């Protein structure tokens, strides 16, 4: 047999896919990196399946380093029990993730775009609890809310792409779950690529009003070690 793990795969073809015979576009290359995922289980990063008050010390969710590139970045989020990543987006970015183990829900949306031929401002007379003050006003933008399925490991890879399922909120559904994801060029909040967070507004693809907001005083992400096979 003689491979290597596949979780060295996934990395390799990451890299192919982010950056004498002709050798795989983009197209194929992402059908070929969305199947390597497929086949992901937990047991093949040694992340042993968890479950079960937590200490306002103690992080709602935890980070895996397993891999970056200036193509890609490369880890694991692990949400305990209850917890969710608060809705964000990835600005031009690519990404796949296949969730390990436990159940999450992600819901999948995108800020109106006059590129892909819809129309975006915000009627005055609008209303919703909490009301607005004038500079939120401003700020917000019209959305489209996509999906909200919610995913186990029999799912296949969630994928998003820069215009369409751009923003996305994940919840740890009936215990803790956690994520293998891919993400295509990775963050840079020095670069002005920053993960920026939203909420929907309150006054079935519906147009929906998004507005930008700082990370949530109690959300936060940790660094944890990770048991797996080490790439390259
Ligand atoms: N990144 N933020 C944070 N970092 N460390 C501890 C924290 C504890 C409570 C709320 C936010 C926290
Ligand atoms: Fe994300």
């Given at each position: ?15 192919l ?23 992901l ?72 775009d ?49 215009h ?27 670069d ?41």
């Amino acid at each position: 047999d003689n491979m290597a793990s596949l979780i060295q795969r996934i990395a390799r073809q990451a890299s192919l896919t982010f950056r004498a015979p002709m050798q795989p576009g983009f197209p194929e290359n992402l059908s070929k990196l969305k199947s390597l995922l497929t086949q992901l289980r937990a047991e093949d990063l040694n992340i042993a399946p968890r479950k079960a008050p937590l200490p306002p010390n103690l992080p709602p969710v935890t980070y895996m380093h397993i891999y970056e590139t200036d193509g890609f970045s490369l880890g694991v989020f692990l949400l305990k029990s209850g917890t969710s990543i608060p809705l964000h987006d990835h600005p031009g970015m690519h990404g796949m993730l296949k969730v390990l183990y436990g159940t999450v829900r992600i819901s999948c949306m995108d800020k109106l775009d006059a590129g892909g031929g819809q129309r975006p401002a915000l009627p005055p007379e609008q209303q919703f609890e909490p009301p607005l003050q004038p500079r939120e006003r401003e700020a917000v933008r019209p959305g489209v809310l996509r999906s909200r399925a919610e995913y186990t490991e029999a799912s296949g890879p969630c994928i998003l792409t820069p215009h369409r399922d751009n923003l996305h909120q994940i919840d740890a559904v009936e215990g803790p779950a956690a994520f293998l994801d891919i993400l295509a060029p990775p963050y840079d909040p020095d670069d002005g690529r920053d993960c920026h967070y939203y909420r929907v507004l309150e006054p079935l693809p519906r147009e929906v009003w998004l507005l930008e907001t700082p990370q949530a005083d109690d959300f936060w992400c940790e660094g944890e070690p990770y048991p797996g096979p080490k790439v390259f």
